[PDB]
């Protein structure tokens, strides 16, 4: 519910060094392709960070209904951008219960 917004501006962005930072499978983008992110360029880049369940990953998409989409974090219907998600069992889970 309290996801962080980071404003990214006035720099040179390298999108090929993203794969060395986190072990994600799919660079699932919507308005563009991941292989063309270095030639063209944008005005502003905004990054939203939150930790959700594995069943709720499919709700981070335009035109979706559920729990996170309609009550926690909503993506627009004309959303251009890209979604990155990966497993975090080794860091965000405890045997006693992560609360």
């Amino acid at each position: 519910y309290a996801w962080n917004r980071k404003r990214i501006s006035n720099c040179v962005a390298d999108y090929s060094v993203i794969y060395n930072f986190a072990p994600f499978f799919a660079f699932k983008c919507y308005g563009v392709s991941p292989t063309k992110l270095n030639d063209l360029c944008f005005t502003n880049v905004y990054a939203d960070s939150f930790v959700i369940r594995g069943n709720e990953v499919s709700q981070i998409a335009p035109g979706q209904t559920g729990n996170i989409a309609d009550y926690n974090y909503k993506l627009p219907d004309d959303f251009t951008g890209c979604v990155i998600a990966w497993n975090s069992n080794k860091l965000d889970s405890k045997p006693s219960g992560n609360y």
Binding site: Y19, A22, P23, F24, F25, W86, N87, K90
Partner: protein, 50 residues
């Protein structure tokens, strides 16, 4: 082994098939029947039907 799931090694085998007009050498198992001529039949010559 302590790395994440996106940094695991993956064994990749890529099969590329030559779809050309050369005579056929390698393909799947189908039993060949006798050839009859001057009859309206369904044929199967090296993969394509009609």
């Amino acid at each position: 082994p302590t790395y994440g799931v996106g940094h695991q090694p993956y064994r990749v085998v890529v099969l590329s098939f030559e779809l050309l007009h050369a005579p056929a050498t390698v393909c799947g198992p189908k039993k060949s029947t006798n050839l009859v001529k001057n009859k309206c039949v369904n044929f199967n010559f090296n993969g394509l039907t009609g």
